[PDB]
Amino acid sequence: MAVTEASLLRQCPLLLPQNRSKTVYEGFISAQGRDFHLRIVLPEDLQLKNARLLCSWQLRTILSGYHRIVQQRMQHSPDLMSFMMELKMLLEVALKNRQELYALPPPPQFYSSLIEEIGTLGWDKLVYADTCFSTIKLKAEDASGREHLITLKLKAKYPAESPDYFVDFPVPFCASWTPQSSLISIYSQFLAAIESLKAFWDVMDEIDEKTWVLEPEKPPRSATARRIALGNNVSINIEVDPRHPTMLPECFFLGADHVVKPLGIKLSRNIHLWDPENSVLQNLKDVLEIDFPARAILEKSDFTMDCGICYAYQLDGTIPDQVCDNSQCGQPFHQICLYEWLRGLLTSRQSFNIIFGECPYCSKPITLKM
Amino acid sequence: MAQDSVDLSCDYQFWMQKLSVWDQASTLETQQDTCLHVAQFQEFLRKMYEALKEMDSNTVIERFPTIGQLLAKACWNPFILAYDESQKILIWCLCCLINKEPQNSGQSKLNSWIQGVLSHILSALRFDKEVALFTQGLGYAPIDYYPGLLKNMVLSLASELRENHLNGFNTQRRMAPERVASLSRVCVPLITLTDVDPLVEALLICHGREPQEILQPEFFEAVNEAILLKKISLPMSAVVCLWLRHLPSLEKAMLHLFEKLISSERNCLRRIECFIKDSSLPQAACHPAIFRVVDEMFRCALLETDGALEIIATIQVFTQCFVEALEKASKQLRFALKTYFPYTSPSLAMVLLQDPQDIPRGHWLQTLKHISELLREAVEDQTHGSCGGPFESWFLFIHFGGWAEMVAEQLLMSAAEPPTALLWLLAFYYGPRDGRQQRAQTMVQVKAVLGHLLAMSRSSSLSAQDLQTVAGAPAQQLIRHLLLNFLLWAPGGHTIAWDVITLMAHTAEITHEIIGFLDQTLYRWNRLGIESPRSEKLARELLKELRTQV
Numbered sequence: 072m073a074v075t076e077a078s079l080l081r082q083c084p085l086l087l088p089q090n091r092s093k094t095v096y097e098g099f100i101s102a103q104g105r106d107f108h109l110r111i112v113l114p115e116d117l118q119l120k121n122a123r124l125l126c127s128w129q130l131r132t133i134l135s136g137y138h139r140i141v142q143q144r145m146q147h148s149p150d151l152m153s154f155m156m157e158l159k160m161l162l163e164v165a166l167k168n169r170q171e172l173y174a175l176p177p178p179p180q181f182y183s184s185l186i187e188e189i190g191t192l193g194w195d196k197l198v199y200a201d202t203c204f205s206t207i208k209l210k211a212e213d214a215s216g217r218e219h220l221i222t223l224k225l226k227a228k229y230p231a232e233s234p235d236y237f238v239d240f241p242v243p244f245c246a247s248w249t250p251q252s253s254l255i256s257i258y259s260q261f262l263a264a265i266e267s268l269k270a271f272w273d274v275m276d277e278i279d280e281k282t283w284v285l286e287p288e289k290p291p292r293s294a295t296a297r298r299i300a301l302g303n304n305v306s307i308n309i310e311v312d313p314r315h316p317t318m319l320p321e322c323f324f325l326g327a328d329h330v331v332k333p334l335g336i337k338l339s340r341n342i343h344l345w346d347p348e349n350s351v352l353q354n355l356k357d358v359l360e361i362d363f364p365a366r367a368i369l370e371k372s373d374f375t376m377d378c379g380i381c382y383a384y385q386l387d388g389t390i391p392d393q394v395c396d397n398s399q400c401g402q403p404f405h406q407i408c409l410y411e412w413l414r415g416l417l418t419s420r421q422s423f424n425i426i427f428g429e430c431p432y433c434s435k436p437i438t439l440k441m
Numbered sequence: 442m443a444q445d446s447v448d449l450s451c452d453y454q455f456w457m458q459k460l461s462v463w464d465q466a467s468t469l470e471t472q473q474d475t476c477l478h479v480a481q482f483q484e485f486l487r488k489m490y491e492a493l494k495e496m497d498s499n500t501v502i503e504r505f506p507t508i509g510q511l512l513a514k515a516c517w518n519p520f521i522l523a524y525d526e527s528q529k530i531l532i533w534c535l536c537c538l539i540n541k542e543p544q545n546s547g548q549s550k551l552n553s554w555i556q557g558v559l560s561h562i563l564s565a566l567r568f569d570k571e572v573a574l575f576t577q578g579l580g581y582a583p584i585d586y587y588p589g590l591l592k593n594m595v596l597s598l599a600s601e602l603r604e605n606h607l608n609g610f611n612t613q614r615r616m617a618p619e620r621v622a623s624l625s626r627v628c629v630p631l632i633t634l635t636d637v638d639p640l641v642e643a644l645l646i647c648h649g650r651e652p653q654e655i656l657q658p659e660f661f662e663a664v665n666e667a668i669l670l671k672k673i674s675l676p677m678s679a680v681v682c683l684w685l686r687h688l689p690s691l692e693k694a695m696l697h698l699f700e701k702l703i704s705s706e707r708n709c710l711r712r713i714e715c716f717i718k719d720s721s722l723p724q725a726a727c728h729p730a731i732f733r734v735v736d737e738m739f740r741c742a743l744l745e746t747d748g749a750l751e752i753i754a755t756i757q758v759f760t761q762c763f764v765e766a767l768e769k770a771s772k773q774l775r776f777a778l779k780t781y782f783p784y785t786s787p788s789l790a791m792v793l794l795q796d797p798q799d800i801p802r803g804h805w806l807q808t809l810k811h812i813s814e815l816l817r818e819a820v821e822d823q824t825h826g827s828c829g830g831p832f833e834s835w836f837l838f839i840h841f842g843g844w845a846e847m848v849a850e851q852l853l854m855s856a857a858e859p860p861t862a863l864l865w866l867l868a869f870y871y872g873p874r875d876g877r878q879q880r881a882q883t884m885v886q887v888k889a890v891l892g893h894l895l896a897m898s899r900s901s902s903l904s905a906q907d908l909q910t911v912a913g914a915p916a917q918q919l920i921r922h923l924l925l926n927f928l929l930w931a932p933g934g935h936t937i938a939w940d941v942i943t944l945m946a947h948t949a950e951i952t953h954e955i956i957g958f959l960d961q962t963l964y965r966w967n968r969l970g971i972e973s974p975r976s977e978k979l980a981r982e983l984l985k986e987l988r989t990q991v
């Protein structure tokens with residue numbers, strides 16, 4: 072209702088006014104099926120500019136951080152009713168964020184059904200389960216003999232709503248979930264999607280075997296790009312379409328302007344000779360009319376010696392000179408890029424011509440002297 | 442000799458009651474309001490100038506009632522007196538009201554008042570006190586330090602903005618966002634003042650971390666307008682960031698390209714190429730966000746007309762500029778072509794990107810014959826994992842000039858036994874979304890027409906009526922254009938071109954269309970470096986004379 076005579080009853084039922092002059096309320100306040108203790112005190116008059124509000128330690132740890140907002144709302148809010156509406160909203164938010172600490176599943180259905188279902192799959196499948204039992208991860212095989220993992224994240228009510236499925240492979244995976252469905256169902260759909268993309272996989276497997284793939288180093292299964300190296304200090308990057316892998320790829324050239332140009336010309340002349348019945352390599356070799364090196368250098372690949380902020384060599388005469396003091400990063404930078412970055416971060420502090428801060432990549436102490 | 446007073450006597454009262462509301466813009470709301478209306482005020486003063494110039498002072502009393510109050514109110518408002526020409530005109534109006542030989546005291550008082558207000562404009566010390574005091578001692582007049590002070594004032598401000606940008610999420614000294622908006626409003630009336638340009642470029646590059654827009658859209662529009670008339674000359678990074686923070690400004694800029702291809706410079710592709718390269722759109726369109734929105738305005742125009750040849754050519758020019766700038770300035774880590782052209786198979790684009798400068802003139806046939814095959818697959822065999830439809834694969838193919846126009850000329854070069862796949866490509870060009878029955882009927886008509894044309898070419902120089910027989914619909918523009926390509930190609934041309942052109946140019950639309958066609962063709966030839974000087978001179982003369990009919 073509008074007035075605070077029946078609306079306050081209806082919208083905060085478990086707040087009971089103690090005093091006849093309705094000034095002290097005490098009781099509980101509700102949020103996502105959970106009641107929090109709360110005790111409020113007004114002045115002699117109905118002004119919230121000054122009021123007491125005490126809570127249980129349950130409620131304060133959950134309204135941790137938002138303390139200043141609530142304190143502000145005490146002073147800014149006109150009526151008590153609206154202040155409570157706002158505090159229930161606010162409370163909902165603070166709970167929905169830290170949903171990790173605050174939950175309880177319905178065991179009689181849940182834990183047993185999930186273990187029945189993992190038995191229905193087969194214990195050869197399951198590879199990981201989280202202590203909250205929320206995330207689990209299963210495995211499958213290709214006919215080619217490739218492992219593909221699938222992460223599910225489960226809610227408090229597993230069979231009721233959909234579980235969030237996360238998978239590596241590059242086409243979007245679609246799983247028809249029903250309330251009747253279960254882990255065997257989505258797993259069968261996953262095996263179907265695996266067998267669909269077999270051809271893309273074959274392509275990328277053949278490439279990563281018989282060629283020096285360069286910068287998807289140890290590439291994922293999501294990865295469509297393969298910067299292949301050829302000759303010396305020149306590369307061709309190659310993006311492949313999953314639905315049509317054997318089809319012509321997107322390819323272009325990085326390196327020396329004088330070496331690449333005749334290659335682009337030869338490509339232009341031979342592109343009509345592309346054929347999606349052979350292999351990608353077996354087509355590219357006769358299209359660009361050259362052979363590849365099979366790992367010409369395995370040790371000293373092109374360790375990226377670029378700014379790791381601007382990703383360029385040769386920024387305004389400057390060289391990547393400022394580096395990381397770390398064995399695992401060793402990442403060069405520029406003065407200018409790394410100065411504009413460190414002057415940003417909140418952690419950084421500046422002496423006379425020195426700034427100490429965190430390396431962007433590894434977050435270790437790095438020093439810059441202008 | 443119609444109004445001479447009425448519209449102006451209304452505007453007078455409007456402006457005078459508005460100046461009274463405004464004066465001196467010492468607040469927020471007077472400022473925003475002045476910056477809006479000022480442009481019209483300028484025109485009003487030009488008309489007022491014309492009115493007072495033609496007549497004389499001190500004799501006539503038409504609007505002499507309140508001209509004084511108007512010019513005063515104007516002068517003490519500095520957002521008026523700093524706009525493009527307002528001050529110069531305001532001087533003029535007071536110069537007209539002066540009198541050489543005052544008789545009544547009113548004329549002398551007026552002249553004195555005029556000297557007073559002029560002196561206020563030019564030479565009044567409304568500045569800080571101690572700085573005024575310091576200079577007189579050193580023997581400096583206002584003029585010979587005003588410039589440095591401004592310059593040194595501007596640089597200061599620019600640094601502060603520069604520093605506010607780097608202090609993103611830092612415990613110090615946040616430049617109060619009120620002052621940034623204030624500066625943005627103050628730069629607007631004086632954007633054509635060269636001395637401030639340093640401030641603009643800093644305001645646009647120093648976006649800040651505030652999630653709301655701290656600058657107000659009166660500012661973006663002024664900069665945007667002024668980039669396009671070439672009255673400010675910023676650097677490219679500034680305009681790219683203006684485009685990327687204010688999409689309605691990129692619409693108003695890409696519309697200013699469509700007026701360039703519709704009104705002013707119809708079918709002069711050299712002036713369009715010059716405009717596009719000089720404008721920054723190609724450089725700015727390396728950003729995928731701006732190419733998806735610039736491409737969406739081209740599509741809207743491609744649909745409003747049902748495939749106007751004038752739009753197509755502009756798109757071809759744009760795409761050629763864009764390509765060598767995507768290429769030019771992204772060495773490592775560039776965006777993948779399915780990100781600019783996200784609907785088609787990337788394969789197809791990767792083919793159509795290959796410039797025909799790079800290919801021998803003889804191997805163009807093979808490349809086209811291959812493209813045709815892959816396009817036929819993409820349209821007719823419309824299965825999952827392909828285009829959205831025929832229109833999309835079309836709209837791609839349209840972006841790449843060179844390929845689309847060489848088709849007819851290669852059919853003529855291989856006129857004996859034309860390849861059906863090329864016939865398919867050509868028929869597809871002039872109409873997609875037809876269905877095989879239509880495309881087949883069109884193709885067989887075209888093949889018969891090609892049979893007629895090879896016979897006619899290997900014959901002597903014949904009439905134009907023999908051509909109107911086979912010409913004699915939904916498939917007219919294809920046959921028209923093929924016949925024009927025949928005229929330019931065959932050496933039987935340059936004798937009987939006029940005879941066909943006059944008959945074909947029924948309306949003005951077909952004439953304009955043919956002009957456009959010929960311009961596109963000469964641009965294309967001169968670009969690809971493919972030329973037969975017969976056709977060059979022929980087309981130039983025809984274009985010259987057809988530009989007269991309009």
Ligand SMILES: [Zn+2]
Pocket residue numbers: 378380381382383386404405406407408409
């Ligand atoms: Zn750098």
Ligand SMILES: [Zn+2]
Pocket residue numbers: 395396397400401402430431432433434435
């Ligand atoms: Zn590091």
